[PDB]
């Protein structure tokens, strides 16, 4: 049982480059991106460096941030996919279920993970090297500003729990191995596996956070909140996909948002 929680926490460490430990040690010399000038200064890309001339028109600023939001999540989706392979019993499931579980579960896992790299004034980006301000994300266009702002307000509430990476490791495994996803075939086997993980998390929270009662149902509450947050996010993404014709979506993201 204890080795179960350390197996997942092992895989978490093995698969996710950015951790809450490394994140909070940075947050408490990142290059601050607070305007169009500093946003462009974050480059280092040799091809980008060879092509840059001046500052971008206006519409390019929001598409660029929207492009960086895609890249962030795409990388994290591929990490979460490996992470899931190491979760006990996940690989024994039907490959369809494995895909279905990841399809509807990755964003919920991401937004909980991304709370680690966030505070009330902004978030860490680009391998912890830069810090994008909240004000700048308010200064973008409405469609792209209205999808970033709900996340900040959730992240600060999630960070009030004062969890660590060993808590997140199990918590994320619980989000992925979720029973009530559309089209999920072998439901009993997934719920069974989730109970094992839920039983592991219940023990871990008591062994890691002694003097903070009622913390488990709090985390269960956040799972329902992560669903509603993603439910709104996906809707705002599809409204964007409809209206924003000069905007496209990464092939990995296209899959996930196909049939939601
Ligand atoms: C357009 C889009 C926006 C966000 C919003 N994300 C999730 C999130 C959580 C907590 C704080 C800030 C955020 C925000 C985010 O990652 N922003 C972000 C990331 C990198 C850079 Cl360089 C700049 C910014 Cl503004 C998330 C997904 C997405 O679409 C891609 C996808 O759904 O996969």
UniProtKB/Swiss-Prot annotation:
GO molecular-function term, one example from the UniProt record: DNA-binding transcription repressor activity, RNA polymerase II-specific
An annotated GO cellular component: nucleus
Modification after translation (UniProt): 'Lys-48'-linked polyubiquitinated; leading to proteasomal degradation. Deubiquitinated and stabilized by OTUD3.
Tissue-level expression: Ubiquitous with maximal levels in placenta and skeletal muscle.
A Gene Ontology biological process term: fatty acid catabolic process
Family membership noted in the UniProt record: Belongs to the nuclear hormone receptor family. NR1 subfamily.
Subunit architecture: Heterodimer with the retinoid X receptor. Interacts (via domain NR LBD) with CRY1 and CRY2 in a ligand-dependent manner.
Known role: Ligand-activated transcription factor key mediator of energy metabolism in adipose tissues. Receptor that binds peroxisome proliferators such as hypolipidemic drugs and fatty acids. Has a preference for poly-unsaturated fatty acids, such as gamma-linoleic acid and eicosapentanoic acid. Once activated by a ligand, the receptor binds to promoter elements of target genes. Regulates the peroxisomal beta-oxidation pathway of fatty acids. Functions as transcription activator for the acyl-CoA oxidase gene. Decreases expression of NPC1L1 once activated by a ligand.
Protein name per Swiss-Prot or TrEMBL: Peroxisome proliferator-activated receptor delta
Gene that encodes it: PPARD
């Amino acid at each position: 049982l204890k080795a179960f929680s350390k197996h997942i926490y092992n895989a978490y460490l093995k698969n996710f480059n950015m951790t809450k430990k490394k994140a909070r040690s940075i947050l408490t010399a990142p290059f601050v991106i607070h305007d169009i000038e500093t946003l462009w200064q974050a480059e280092k890309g040799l091809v980008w460096k060879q092509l840059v001339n001046g500052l971008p028109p206006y519409k390019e600023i929001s598409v660029h941030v929207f492009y960086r939001c895609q890249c962030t999540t795409v990388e994290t989706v591929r990490e979460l996919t490996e992470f899931a392979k190491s979760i006990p019993s996940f690989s024994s499931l039907f490959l369809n279920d494995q895909v279905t579980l990841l399809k509807y579960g990755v964003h919920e896992a991401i937004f909980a993970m991304l709370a680690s790299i966030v505070n009330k004034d902004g978030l860490l980006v680009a391998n912890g090297s830069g810090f994008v301000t909240r004000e700048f994300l308010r200064s973008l266009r409405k469609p792209f500003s209205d999808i970033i702002e709900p996340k900040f307000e959730f992240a600060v509430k999630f960070n009030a729990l004062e969890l660590d990476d060993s808590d997140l490791a199990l918590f994320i495994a619980a989000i992925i191995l979720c029973g009530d996803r559309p089209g999920l075939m072998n439901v009993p086997r997934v719920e069974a596996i989730q109970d094992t993980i839920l039983r592991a998390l219940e023990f871990h929270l008591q062994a890691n956070h002694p003097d903070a009662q009622y913390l488990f149902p709090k985390l269960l509450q956040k799972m329902a909140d992560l669903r509603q947050l993603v439910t709104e996010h996906a809707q705002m993404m599809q409204r964007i996909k409809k209206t924003e014709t000069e905007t496209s979506l990464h092939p990995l993201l296209q899959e996930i948002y196909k049939d939601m």
